[PDB]
Design a protein around this ligand. Structure first.
Ligand code: HEM
Ligand code: HEM
Lengths: 137, 137
């Protein structure tokens, strides 16, 4: 289920974070508007970039904590406020987060593994609602 | 406290895992008998090896899960058995883990951060006696 998936991702976080983030960027190429240092590079080139590895790790480290702190896939208000008020998230709207989780759930559904895809869909939709409530457009 | 330290470490897991694992190897150089592939390499060389970082990341993820599951810094007997029964752990005594946590606590005390060093000291002692219970010599 959802709690076990959190442990699965944490067990190999580097690989999942990189693979899921790449699925996001390849499914929604226009999202590189936000990460212009990743333009013009293949997956293998991104995976050898220090900055890419560090960013994906810290994103998914934090995403797994937000997931771990949720109840029934509903994230804490404090966690959403953190995400809205991060300096690095200044320009973003909820549609950006929706697309990350669409790609994440698609990655799980295409995986050989028994991820609780439906739970992560709910988590994504509940996080977006939480971010709206904390002020994200 | 202990719970917040878990979140602090998870937030930047690979960086804390490498620094702590390095402080352990450097405090107890004999312990490299167990990691032959790290012999003859400075900290910076080890930090450049993807395999070194992958190992430290998986170790400290599991350590943070055993920590998160503990009650009042008392690990589950089941986790202690898992760590004894791992094949990679075949032939270790509790002195090996005792030394890891001494280096971990010393690292925290020297940090400029308000880690709850005493809790980690107790978690390490309680893990060591739990590995003893679960059959480690
Ligand atoms: C959904 C869960 C998300 C989490 C947990 C998360 C977390 C993070 C973290 C930890 C950082 C690093 C901040 C630092 O270095 O202190 C970061 C940076 C950043 N995030 Fe996110 N983020 C999420 C979603 C998104 C989305 C959907 C976008 C855009 C589509 C985005 C855009 C950015 C940008 C542009 C930066 C910093 C610029 C850079 O990479 O140098 N984030 N985020
Ligand atoms: C709470 C403490 C510890 C935890 C959570 C832990 C966890 C792990 C994990 C998850 C792995 C597998 C990593 C992978 O799959 O890549 C591993 C491997 C290993 N561990 Fe530990 N460990 C701990 C303490 C120790 C100590 C104190 C020693 C020896 C001083 C040790 C010796 C080893 C060795 C030799 C390997 C195999 C390394 C290799 O294949 O290159 N472990 N440990």
């Amino acid at each position: 289920g959802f709690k076990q998936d959190i442990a699965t991702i944490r067990g190999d976080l580097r690989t999942y974070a990189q693979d899921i983030f790449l699925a996001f960027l390849n499914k929604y190429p226009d999202e590189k508007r936000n990460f212009k240092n990743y333009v013009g590079k293949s997956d293998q080139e991104l995976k050898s970039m220090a900055k890419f590895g560090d960013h994906t790790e810290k994103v998914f480290n934090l995403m797994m904590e937000v997931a771990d702190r949720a109840t029934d896939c509903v994230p804490l208000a404090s966690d959403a406020s953190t995400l809205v008020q991060m300096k690095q998230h200044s320009g973003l709207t909820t549609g950006n987060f929706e697309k990350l989780f669409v790609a994440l759930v698609e990655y799980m559904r295409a995986s050989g593994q028994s991820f609780d895809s439906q739970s992560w869909d709910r988590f994504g939709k509940n996080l977006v609602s939480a971010l709206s409530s904390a002020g994200m457009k």
